[PDB]
Amino acid sequence: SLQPGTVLILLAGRFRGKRVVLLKCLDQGVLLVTGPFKINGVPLRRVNARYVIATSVKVDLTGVDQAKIDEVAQPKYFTAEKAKEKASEEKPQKKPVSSTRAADQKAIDKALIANIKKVDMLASYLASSFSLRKGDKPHLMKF
């Protein structure tokens, strides 16, 4: 159900309800996803397949740099400056985004965002949170 370039619905974590786009499927059940940030605020981040839900909206990935994605897919990209950043955090101010990280998003979200602005109302879909109304049945409704 999940392929490179598929819209996912996060069910847990800080970004709960936030519909995102899965770009690359990693190993041991982890997934590399992104908003894109300019749409719903979700950055280039890795989540769990058991906590995502796969919709059938599939977005085109033509023109997207696979090499750049495969660099973020490495096993120390996110958990690297983690020790230094948290320690440095110790009036409150927003911790700064690794120059490298703010620099990477822009590339991938520029290409992906362009292919999303093409499909009718898709920006609106991705920017909105999924929520459960009254009378809707998760075992019957098709995603």
């Binding site: 159900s1 069910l11 847990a12 709960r16 309800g17 397949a49 058991r50 906590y51 995502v52 839900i53 796969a54 949170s129 999924f130 929520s131 459960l132 109304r133 009378g135 049945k137 998760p138 075992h139 995603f143």
Partner: protein
């Protein structure tokens, strides 16, 4: 102005324990999920998470909300009521009480 709901769980009601005519077993509880009517509907939610959320008197680590976690194990009967196993048996005062049934781990 979002003026919209923020629910991501399915409502459920802790009804009772798995019991005989006399003997009661607090290990496994009976949960009535909102909108489930039959065993196929139950089979969709087998394996899903369930949380009993209640309010306490003392705030221990920033909140008075305490939660008991468990999972849906197997369907019960023919009416969609499910059996659930929790890390601790439920207080037995929460018969007919609310539980939150979470969709993870997901398979769809």
């Amino acid at each position: 102005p979002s003026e919209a709901g923020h629910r991501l769980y399915v409502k459920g009601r802790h009804l009772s324990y798995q019991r005989g005519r006399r003997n009661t077993h607090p290990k496994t509880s009976l949960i009535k999920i909102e909108g489930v009517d039959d065993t196929a509907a139950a089979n969709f939610y087998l394996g899903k998470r369930v949380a009993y959320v209640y309010r306490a008197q003392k705030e221990v680590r920033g909140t008075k909300i305490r939660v008991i976690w468990g999972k849906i194990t197997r369907p019960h009967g023919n009416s969609g009521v499910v059996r659930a196993k929790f890390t601790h048996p439920l207080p037995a005062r929460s018969f007919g009480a609310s539980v939150r049934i979470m969709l993870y781990p997901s398979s769809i």
